[PDB]
Amino acid sequence: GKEWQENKSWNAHFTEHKSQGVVVLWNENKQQGFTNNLKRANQAFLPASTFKIPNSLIALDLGVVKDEHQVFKWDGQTRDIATWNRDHNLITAMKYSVVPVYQEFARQIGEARMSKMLHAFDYGNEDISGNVDSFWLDGGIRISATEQISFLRKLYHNKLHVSERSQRIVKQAMLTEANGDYIIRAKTGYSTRIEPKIGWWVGWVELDDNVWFFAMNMDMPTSDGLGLAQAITKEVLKQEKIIP
Amino acid sequence: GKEWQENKSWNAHFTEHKSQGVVVLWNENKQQGFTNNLKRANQAFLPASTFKIPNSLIALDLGVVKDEHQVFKWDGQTRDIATWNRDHNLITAMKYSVVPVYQEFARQIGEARMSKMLHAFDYGNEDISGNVDSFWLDGGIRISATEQISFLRKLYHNKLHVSERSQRIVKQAMLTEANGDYIIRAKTGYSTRIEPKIGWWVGWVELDDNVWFFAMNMDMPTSDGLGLAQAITKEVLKQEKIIP
Ligand SMILES: [Br-]
Ligand SMILES: [Br-]
DSSP: OOSEEEOGGGHHHHHHTTOOEEEEEEETTTTEEEESOHHHHTOOBOOGGGGHHHHHHHHHHHTSSOOTTOOBOOOSOOOSSGGGSSOBOHHHHHHTTOHHHHHHHHHHHOHHHHHHHHHHHTOTTOOOOSOTTTHHHHSSOOBOHHHHHHHHHHHHTTOSSSOHHHHHHHHHHTEEEEOSSOEEEEEEEEEOSSSSOEEEEEEEEEOSSOEEEEEEEEEOSSGGGTTHHHHHHHHHHHHTTSOO | OOSEEEOGGGHHHHHHTTOOEEEEEEETTTTEEEESOHHHHTOEEOOGGGGHHHHHHHHHHHTSSOSTTOOBOOOSOOOSSGGGSSOBOHHHHHHTTOHHHHHHHHHHHOHHHHHHHHHHHTOTTOOOOSOTTTHHHHSSOOEEHHHHHHHHHHHHTTOSSSOHHHHHHHHHHTEEEEOSSOEEEEEEEEEOSSSSOEEEEEEEEEOSSOEEEEEEEEEOSSGGGTTHHHHHHHHHHHHTTSOO
16 A cells, blocks of 8 residues: 555544644554644644653763663752652653753753754754753754654664663653553653644554554643543544554 | 561452462562561462563573564464464563463573573572473472562562663563553463462562562462452552552
8 A cells, every 4th residue: 555645534533622633653564654634744843842752862872861760859949740849760750741850961961962962863853953951842943743753663673873771761761551452652742832832642552563653743722631642642543443 | 667567458359359379569668578478478389471581581681582573483383372373572472471482492591591590590499400491380490479579679670690681671571551650560370280270470560659569379270260360469559559
């Protein structure tokens, strides 16, 4: 069959949740892509907290993060997300999307190494313009759903230009769901500082005999629907019989 | 601060399921152990498929298994477990407890290296007497629930005398269940070749801020009740408020 196939029926899952957006799927065995919107699949947005994936990789590879157990002490500044107001390691910082910990990583990485690593990763537009500690939230960096899939496929295969160890640790930190039928490794992101306000969910589904990569973004008028990126993606995964 | 405490109230979970056995828990932060039966906690049994944990480690460290993607082709001999009659990698061989794949690993490891590795691991009675490809089913090797916990704690901390990489890959292969509340890395086993017939479940529960190691075995006259090992462990984890 064709390399990319458009399936507009997935739009019903967006419409149900009063949104619009794109889901991109990649069948690794068959080397075939599926999307409800070919053009939005290639439209580039701020990555927001999906940037915690490359940020983690670079921080581990440079020794800014020694391992997934190293504690990053709360700076003692009360923020609006309760789970951020405590000590974190890489596992909990990824799980609760703890921006302050990743802002500290970014400052220690520095502009020069951050720029060189994103170039080596071929990551989105590779543009870190703005604050070294906020550019993925309100700076110049842009990435499309298809570019997220290209990056994730390299991570899955340990083909990024960082140690095998760095890639294994980040894939561990990405763990979201597992049962006897499937494993999901993924990262949410909510781009709310600059229009258009969007939610991301990017990662993959590990089956016994295949991997399905996914990258989705949706218009997100308010953070009321934080759970929606996952709920919409799962409706598409269920329709395509990837998960029960 | 007491090291080992007996909690016979867990026996209600065994009685409810018309069963007998032992659950051993270890609170990693507090360095405290809990069990419904101090004597049975320290009684040694054949490890059966719980042996796939050290077997995997040794196979990876010696290069018998290159990585978790390497395919082990079905030998084309029809066996009575449908999931065994197909190709496997380390992930699926662990998940479906595919004995024939691990018997082939054991043959390539050989007696001398298997013996040396189990001594280095301080694994159970370290006795491989019998056939190098079946000793964990009907040879000399024996391990207690408390000995399972001692071995698993070393694996968790990457303290076994094999590469960090080997230990990370086996911990990935052990992934059983994950959600927003906990991660379970574990391995089942069913010892049938010598009395008493027992089911095992050994591993750990990863929380945000703690790890609970567990090792349980139960009398298992038929494979009808294999699912009880997990159900009983979870009733104990719930009673102790480790998981919802
Ligand atoms: Br590694
Ligand atoms: Br994992």
